[PDB]
Symmetry: C2
Subunit: 407 residues, 2 copies
């Protein structure tokens, strides 16, 4: 009835949307919790005997589990499964992260889910997909493995040292993709009244994100080299450089930009040559015989100049650049301050917690932080009551080990 709902402020583009997620750590819960940043009612399912392993992390979970309601229920066993499937009847979106088609193996097929709610949007997040070969389909999902398997890892790092993107980059791309896809499927529901199942394989997500140069390989050209110390694989004066008192990123692009920079770095005599003709806008480091010399002289000029000096000079010449900010430099940055990009909120246990604000910024229906990370099973009793369980019913579930209520 009208009294049977979880209380929370009405806000955001997703007010009134009912999302439930089953999963631990980053990828799945990130996908689920994003809905909550933007106003949805999101229920975080944890197992009864053991909580989400994210909780071991000392601070991150205060951000990654904010705005959530906590259910602790064994969704695969007896009366716990009955409770889970009852919950599905009023759920709009269900997100789960598993080792392949684990839900189907345990008897909760999409068919079973749709029996309880034909409108349900189901997002399955896995390392290798819901179907494929016997060898790969049921393997564990890890960010490093997804990067390794997708060709993402091999293109990150230094010339002679590949490295993964950090931190847990594949988990975030995959989780975000799941949010996106579920919202898209939701659109279809609002016209047809028929749900959807989404097969998000982490390696396919990362495959797409690594295509900029890989498309050359697939279509008759060559795969790009890895960066050298964060410098562009192809274009001189682009990427990461070291100054006297820290790092900068820069983009040496444009006629006057190249002309005046060359003069500064002692290479004026290279201008107007066949190798660097009048009107050159971009220097290809491999194709141009002077590529390595340009880098040598650029490094030397930057090495003896401070970031402020470099920024001042690059501002004069309209060369796009930015200091590589260290973590201690973010909070006091005037743009961060003006936009309240880092904010504070209260934890459930009375402490001020610091971290990023809601992103992005919706004008008419902005997101907000309305509750800190909940404890294990904190909202179990309320959720079960809302879907028709008596106090006696809930007690029975708890004694049978099928649910856990508040600490």
């Amino acid at each position: 009835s009208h009294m049977d709902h979880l209380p929370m402020p009405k806000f955001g583009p997703l007010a009134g949307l009912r999302v439930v997620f089953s999963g631990i750590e980053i990828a799945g819960p990130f996908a689920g919790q994003m809905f909550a940043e933007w106003g949805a009612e999101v229920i975080w399912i944890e197992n009864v005997a053991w909580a989400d392993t994210i909780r071991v992390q000392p601070n991150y979970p205060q951000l990654s589990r904010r705005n959530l309601h906590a259910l602790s229920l064994n969704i695969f066993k007896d009366e716990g499964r009955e409770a889970f499937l009852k919950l599905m009847e009023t759920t709009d979106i269900f997100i789960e992260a598993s080792k392949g088609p684990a839900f189907a193996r345990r008897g909760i097929t999409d068919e079973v889910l749709w029996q309880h709610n034909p409108k349900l949007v189901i997002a399955h997040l896995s390392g290798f997909g819901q179907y494929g070969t016997e060898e790969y389909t049921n393997l564990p999902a890890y960010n490093t493995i997804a990067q390794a398997f997708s060709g993402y890892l091999i293109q990150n790092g230094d010339v002679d040292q590949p490295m993964p993107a950090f931190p847990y980059t594949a988990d975030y791309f995959s989780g975000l993709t799941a949010t996106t896809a579920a919202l898209a499927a939701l659109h279809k529901v609002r016209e047809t009244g028929k749900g959807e199942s989404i097969d998000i394989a982490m390696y396919e997500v990362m495959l797409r994100m690594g295509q900029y140069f890989m498309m050359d390989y697939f279509n008759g050209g060559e795969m790009c080299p890895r960066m050298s110390k964060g410098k562009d694989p192809y274009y001189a004066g682009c990427g990461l450089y070291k100054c006297a008192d820290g790092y900068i990123v820069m983009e040496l692009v444009g006629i006057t930009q190249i002309e005046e920079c060359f003069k500064d770095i002692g290479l004026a005599h290279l201008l107007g040559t066949p190798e660097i003709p009048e009107g050159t806008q971009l220097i290809h480091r491999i194709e141009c015989p002077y590529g390595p010399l340009v880098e040598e002289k650029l490094d030397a000029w930057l090495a003896t100049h401070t970031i402020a000096e470099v920024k001042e000079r690059f501002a004069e010449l309209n060369i796009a650049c930015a200091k590589v900010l260290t973590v201690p430099e973010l909070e006091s940055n005037p743009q961060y301050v003006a936009r309240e990009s880092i904010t504070q909120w209260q934890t459930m246990d009375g402490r001020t917690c610091k971290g990023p604000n809601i992103m992005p910024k919706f004008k008419n229906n902005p997101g907000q932080i309305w509750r800190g990370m909940p404890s294990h099973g904190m909202d179990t009793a309320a959720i079960l009551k809302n879907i028709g369980y008596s106090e006696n019913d809930i007690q029975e579930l708890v004694s049978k080990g099928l649910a856990k209520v508040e600490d």
Copy 2:
């Protein structure tokens, strides 16, 4: 009327949705084109005198601009602005990437957009946001700058060499976020009938993606160190390692996993000590005095073993691992083959093009590739006719330099 629509197959969760985007290169167009992967009608706006600079890229645009309709129109000038605002009247989502609030500066405020369509969802993608300080707000958007400004760059790379995530990682996270947020705002429209404006600042996107360890810094702990050659900052036996014939990623986690691996690598005598007690599941490299020795012996054992040998042994011990696949190894991988993860389609000029399939995989309404990348202004005439312009009207726009039709 019913005859005034752009022809395309009905498919995907987003069939019938009308999306328009203004922008070049990656971030904005990636956001817009994703809608088209999943069935939406998406119109790509290009300037009249110059096309999207993405077109200079030899192969990537065949992937990044597939499934699109091409409009070439000067949306800020005279009759071109009139045409653009008329188009907005039947558009569901407008995405634009600009240097801050450039649209408002040029007279196309959100207020003006909503005058023509009060339901419109507007997504503004920029480097530093739609508001803030005079110093930062109107600066150019670059992937490297976003990584530098957000604390993402400083945490990627090697101990003594920071590097950006590759390729153009911030452009993809930011574009994807814009898609997600626009789809969320779309939900709100379908109940209230009122549109939304979304301020997606690239640095705020990347700020969120780099929080796993940064949340410790903000809340009384320490920022993590950078990885050493792709190895986990904290946990021994986790991350990237070099074998005899290539690289692997691994996860040394678990009691028997550590016990039997130690035996293999010549460290059996370290088991059952105060430093590595019976029942150790995870080795903290900094806290454990044997951390460096474990790495030394692990490197040595892996260095003399092939990937097949390592995989075979790690499969026996239930240690999660994967070969770092090179780009040439993807197509023939049995999982890629089974899932058709890499596919082919026809370009507009009659050639077979190779690249990733649609991701993710929707069960009931799968995405498909229905058209190759269009040419500059290819669909201008059709789009303008649909919104009420005569052949004479279009000719007038073309002669005035306000529109470009097909080559």
